[model samples]
Target chain A: GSHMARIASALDNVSANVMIADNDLNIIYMNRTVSEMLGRAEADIRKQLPNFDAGRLMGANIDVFHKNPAHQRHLLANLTGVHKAELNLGGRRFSLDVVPVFNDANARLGSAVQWTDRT
Target chain B: GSHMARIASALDNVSANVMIADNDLNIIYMNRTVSEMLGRAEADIRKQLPNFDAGRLMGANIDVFHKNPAHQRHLLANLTGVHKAELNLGGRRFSLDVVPVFNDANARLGSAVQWTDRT
Candidate 1:
């Protein structure tokens, strides 16, 4: 019952940016600010790279987040936690916070990432 | 298709207390501090009020949030915005951030409310 939230709900009309990803790290939800900050259409992103391991950077490519298979595997196994850092998204500077998602039963589900410009 | 997220993803291990509400404003998802501050089992609360409007409170009851039907109707229609305030969750002062949710096609979804206790 807790899976219906979207980027709009999580960071609506706020100063920051936000997006929601699925278990496979696919871009499933995002706000206007997030799309703008990344300089890409939410739709175009889905077509270009459906699953980009969004648990590390705001718009870091999956290849970068998990350059190695072992690293990727480890992340998938960790299940729950949060990671925050600063990175450039499509050339814009910002702070990225990545958090792993899980169900009430403690099952790993996906992740939610937020973006805030360097103040 | 943005759902499928849990508390662990949105605010994992943070000093914040967060919760996600369903379309009916019911508490469908929440973080540790949120669950703890309310002094009730997430399960028991669900059974007690399957459709509680948690948008206006760190943990305020639905009746107080929507003191009137007219007010509740207005809040629900705004669909994509963030409203925040200071509140007391079972006696502990905190900041409550309430945001309305929406889908990619601009369809209204649910809401997400985060709590930050007084410093």
Candidate 2:
């Protein structure tokens, strides 16, 4: 927990958007930079829907690519080990990365994703 | 291997740069999108220096921020669990994502990173 805190603190100074999710694609975490990049406050985003996590973002999905199926598939591909993706939505460019978590034994855990404001 | 192939195919259409590295930051894989964005072919980048991988991109590191210490620290922080970062170098803006691969037990594995061209 403490280790994650330090990581989170370091990310606070970054200029990218980030999210972490469970294997089922449920939202677990996102950084402050993400909220600002997306043009909505974190609390406002979470308040947009019920039982929402970062992955299920709907109303909070402001980018043109945010709520689409193809975009979703891209994310799934990344989670399954696709590496990275780029998209242009809402007239803005964004870079998306979905990376799977593995154990020492190489078993799949969950995934973390980052969305960078390319515009 | 087949799974990775599909991922590679999917990433082919992306407009960002991607790289995957080991725990020690050894370059393991990169998508084609990355090569084009960097204005160098993959083979050329891998051959730029002796025993170089994506992380050690020296001659292949074309972006203004690609070879700086602060950028390296940001990457290290992300590898250590910082979600994402943003940088402006070479007169181009980029969104950099460093995601740690973890196991079900939450143990660290390696990392995957993506650099999106915001210019």
lDDT of each: 0.56, 0.53
lDDT (Cα, tens digit) per residue for candidate 2, span B53-72: 44345233333324575666
Q: Per-residue alpha-carbon lDDT of model 2 for A1-119, expressed as tens digits?
A: 33233344544544446665555565556677676566543334344433435434523332332457566655564564536777654355667776665443555555556776666
In model 2, where do residues sit more than 4 Å from their true spots?
A1-14, A40-79, A83-97, A116-119, B1-31, B40-118
DockQ of every candidate: 0.19, 0.11
Best by DockQ: 1
Model 1 chain A lDDT-worst window of ten = A52-61
Q: How good is model 1 by TM-score?
A: 0.44
Worst 10-residue lDDT window, candidate 2 chain A? A56-65
Model 1 interface CAPRI class: incorrect
Provide interface RMSD per model, one decimal.
4.9, 6.6
lDDT of 2 at B71: 62
- Candidate 2 residue pairs in clash (backbone atoms < 3 Å): A27-A54, A101-B102, A102-B102, A102-B103, A103-B103, A118-B118
State in Å the error of residue A73, model 1.
11
DockQ of 1: 0.19
